[PDB]
C-alpha cells in the first residue's frame, strides 16, 4: 500500500507570526476520512489539535482545542486532495512537531482520539521563538 | 500527560551489517500495553515488523512478520521499562523510518494493525547502503 498522507511545511517562526502547514490525501482517505491534525510538544504525549469533516469540497464542518481557537483554522483543497493547517499569532507553547490525522470511521469534525487514528503522515516540526 | 513512548538509535549502515533500535515507555502503558515495532518505507504506509507480550514470570512471547523471520531479535527489560529489536543481516530493502508501537487492547504478541495502535514512538531513520 502506498503512504496515504504526506505532509509539507515547517520551520522556525516568531512568536506573533503566522504559518499554514499542508497535508496531501489519498483519493480514497480524502474522501473517506476525518481529517486532521495532531501536535506533539517537547516530552508530552500528543494532542488534537483540528478536524475537518470527511471529503471537504464545497461545504465542511471543522472543530477545534480550545487552546487553539480562533488563531488556528483548518481547510481544504479538493482538486489536490490536501488539507491545510492555518497557525496565526503563534506562541513559544506551540512549538511542536505536528501530525496529520485520518480516522475513517469518522464522517463529520469533531475531536479524534490518539488511538482511533487509522494513519499518519510524518510529523514536521514547527518552533516559535519567543 | 507525559508522553508515553520515547525512542533510540537509528543511522546510516552498510549492508550485512547490524543496528539496535530501542523504546522506554511509562511504567503504566509498559505493563498494559503490547509492545511492537513498525516501519515505513519512502513512499510506502507502515507495516508490521514484531511484537512482544509479558507472560507470567520472565516470560515473553514474541511474534514476528515474514519479512524480518531469523533476522531481527526482539526483546523488553521490565526493570527499564524498555523494549529493544536487534537487526541483523541488514539489506537495503530494511531502509526505512522506523517506529514503537503499544497496543493496549491486545494481550498476546500476534500480527498488529497500525490502526489498532494506542501510541508510538516518534520516528527514527535507518538507512541500509550497497
Known amino acids: 500500500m502506498e503512504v496515504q498522507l504526506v505532509e509539507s511545511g515547517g520551520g522556525l517562526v516568531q512568536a506573533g507570526d503566522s504559518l499554514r502547514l499542508s497535508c496531501?490525501?489519498?483519493?480514497?482517505?480524502?474522501?473517506?476520512?476525518?481529517?486532521?491534525?495532531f501536535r506533539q510538544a517537547p516530552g508530552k504525549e500528543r494532542e488534537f489539535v483540528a478536524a475537518i469533516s470527511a471529503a471537504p469540497g464545497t461545504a465542511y464542518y471543522a472543530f477545534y482545542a480550545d487552546s487553539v481557537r480562533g488563531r488556528f483554522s483548518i481547510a481544504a483543497d479538493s482538486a489536490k486532495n490536501t488539507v491545510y493547517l492555518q497557525m496565526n499569532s503563534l506562541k513559544p507553547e506551540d512549538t511542536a512537531v505536528?501530525?496529520?490525522?485520518?480516522?475513517?470511521?469518522?464522517?463529520?469534525?469533531?475531536?479524534?482520539?490518539?488511538?482511533?487514528?487509522?494513519?499518519?503522515?510524518?510529523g514536521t516540526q514547527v518552533t516559535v521563538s519567543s | 500527560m507525559e508522553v508515553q513512548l520515547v525512542e533510540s538509535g537509528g543511522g546510516l549502515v552498510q549492508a550485512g551489517d547490524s543496528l539496535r533500535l530501542s523504546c522506554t515507555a511509562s511504567?503504566?502503558?509498559?505493563?498494559?500495553?503490547?509492545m511492537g515495532w513498525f516501519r515505513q518505507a519512502p513512499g510506502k504506509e507502515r507495516e508490521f515488523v514484531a511484537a512482544i507480550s509479558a507472560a507470567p514470570g520472565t516470560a515473553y512471547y514474541a511474534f514476528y512478520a515474514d519479512s524480518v523471520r531469523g533476522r531481527f531479535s526482539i526483546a523488553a527489560d521490565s526493570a527499564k521499562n524498555t523494549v529493544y529489536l536487534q537487526m541483523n543481516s541488514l539489506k537495503p530493502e530494511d531502509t526505512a523510518v522506523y517506529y514503537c508501537?503499544?497496543?493496549?487492547?491486545?494481550?498476546?504478541?500476534?500480527?498488529?494493525?497500525?490502526?489498532?495502535?494506542?501510541?508510538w514512538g516518534q520516528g527514527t531513520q535507518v538507512t541500509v547502503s550497497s
Open positions: 511504567g503504566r502503558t509498559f505493563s498494559r500495553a503490547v
Open positions: 508501537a503499544a497496543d493496549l487492547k491486545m494481550q498476546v504478541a500476534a500480527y498488529m494493525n497500525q490502526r489498532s495502535v494506542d501510541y
